[PDB]
Amino acid sequence: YNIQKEIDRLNEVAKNLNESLIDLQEL
């Protein structure tokens, strides 16, 4: 595995998850 590779991608997962989650909460 490559830890720095997956940190960067999981950070994108987190940001995208949060964006859509917050969108769900304000409709």
Add this chain to the structure above:
Amino acid sequence: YNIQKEIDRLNEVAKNLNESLIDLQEL
């Protein structure tokens, strides 16, 4: 669906993702 039930779970998804990401970042 029940939007609150899914928001609750997705909140927990986000929290657990965040703590996994932090753990990875401190290696």
Add this chain to the structure above:
Amino acid sequence: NIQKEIDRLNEVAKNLNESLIDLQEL
């Protein structure tokens, strides 16, 4: 080394998938 983080992320993925399916099928 990172089995515990893998295990945790697996449960994250399962719960995310279940929410996705529940939003479309319930």
Add this chain to the structure above:
Amino acid sequence: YNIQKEIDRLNEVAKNLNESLIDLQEL
């Protein structure tokens, strides 16, 4: 009301998370 945009985006989030899981268990 219409959550199609969040469903589409969370599907991509899930795909990226799933590939991270696969890649973390590689090698």
